[PDB]
Design a protein around this ligand. Structure first.
Ligand SMILES: O=C(O)C(F)(F)C(F)(F)C(F)(F)C(F)(F)C(F)(F)C(F)(F)C(F)(F)F
Ligand SMILES: O=C(O)C(F)(F)C(F)(F)C(F)(F)C(F)(F)C(F)(F)C(F)(F)C(F)(F)F
Ligand SMILES: O=C(O)C(F)(F)C(F)(F)C(F)(F)C(F)(F)C(F)(F)C(F)(F)C(F)(F)F
Length: 246
């Protein structure tokens, strides 16, 4: 069992490395100096557009990048053992209600308190420049930075995140699922793999597993806040997902 749980953890990490171009390990090395173009004002944004309405151009740009993120997450989900054996309507339902929770978890790997890496680490857009965008675009990334600073304090690595992301995807309580029991059976196995992984990898963080379970609830609140903010404000694929999260 435990040996199988370590094998499951390794399989997920290997697929995680392949499905996502910029891992947290590489992101933190770029963020700490171990090089991206810094966008900190209107002048550097225009310079960076040449090197790599303004508020609408930014929002539409990340709208396309989020759709590409959905593609990467879908590729990773299909590598989770047992996922492709689920009914295709359940695979689509799990992805539709979970991709944004995954996007914000992985986005945290690209952020610090000062800004976020963009374009596969080629750029770095500051948190305060994003806040300077006209309303309502100036508050569109702020809740994500707030979550990331606290989430990053847990100091998870890529091997932890690969299992954590799989746990979120295999949520048996998404609306419209046909066969809840096989999804819950996979998640329980993933949850045991995650608990074993955190115990081995974080010998000085005794309550890390419990804190991560609470983060999964926080992510649902971030998504709810995000779709409400988007109701006040569009890519046709995202509208398909948003129509069911409103
Ligand atoms: O290309 C990417 O993957 C990206 F850089 F992440 C982005 F999604 F395009 C972006 F984050 F929205 C971006 F970088 F901000 C931007 F390119 F859209 C922009 F804002 F710089 C511009 F003005 F080009 F749209
Ligand atoms: O680093 C980037 O290139 C990026 F665009 F910021 C992103 F990380 F890909 C991103 F997470 F997809 C995002 F665009 F920031 C976003 F998806 F979080 C969003 F802000 F667009 C959404 F609207 F989805 F929250
Ligand atoms: O609108 C539909 O009829 C649809 F096919 F269900 C869908 F909305 F496109 C969707 F499949 F849910 C989806 F949003 F595109 C999806 F995200 F689930 C996905 F299947 F396309 C992806 F693969 F991206 F997860």
């Amino acid at each position: 069992e435990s040996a199988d749980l370590r094998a499951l953890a390794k399989h997920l990490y290997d697929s995680y490395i392949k499905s996502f171009p910029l891992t947290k390990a590489k992101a933190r090395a770029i963020l700490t100096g171990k090089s991206p173009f810094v966008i900190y004002d209107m002048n550097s944004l225009m310079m960076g557009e040449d090197k790599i309405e303004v508020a609408i151009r930014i929002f539409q740009g990340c709208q396309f990048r989020s759709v590409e993120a959905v593609q990467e997450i879908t590729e990773y989900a299909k590598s989770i053992p047992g996922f492709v054996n689920l009914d295709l309507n359940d695979q689509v339902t799990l992805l539709k209600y979970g991709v944004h929770e995954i996007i914000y978890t992985m986005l945290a790997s690209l952020m610090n308190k000062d800004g976020v890496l963009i374009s596969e680490g080629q750029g770095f857009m500051t948190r305060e420049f994003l806040k300077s965008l006209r309303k309502p675009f100036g508050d569109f990334m702020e809740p994500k930075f707030e979550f990331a600073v606290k989430f990053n304090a847990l100091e998870l690595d890529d091997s932890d995140l690969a299992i954590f992301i799989a746990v979120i995807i295999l949520s048996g309580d998404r609306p419209g699922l046909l066969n809840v029991k096989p999804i819950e059976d996979i998640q329980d196995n993933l949850l045991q793999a995650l608990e074993l992984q955190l115990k081995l990898n974080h010998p000085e963080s005794s309550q890390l597993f419990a804190k991560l379970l609470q983060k999964m609830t926080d992510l649902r609140q971030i998504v709810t806040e995000h779709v409400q903010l988007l109701q006040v404000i569009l890519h046709p694929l995202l509208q398909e997902i948003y129509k069911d999260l409103y």
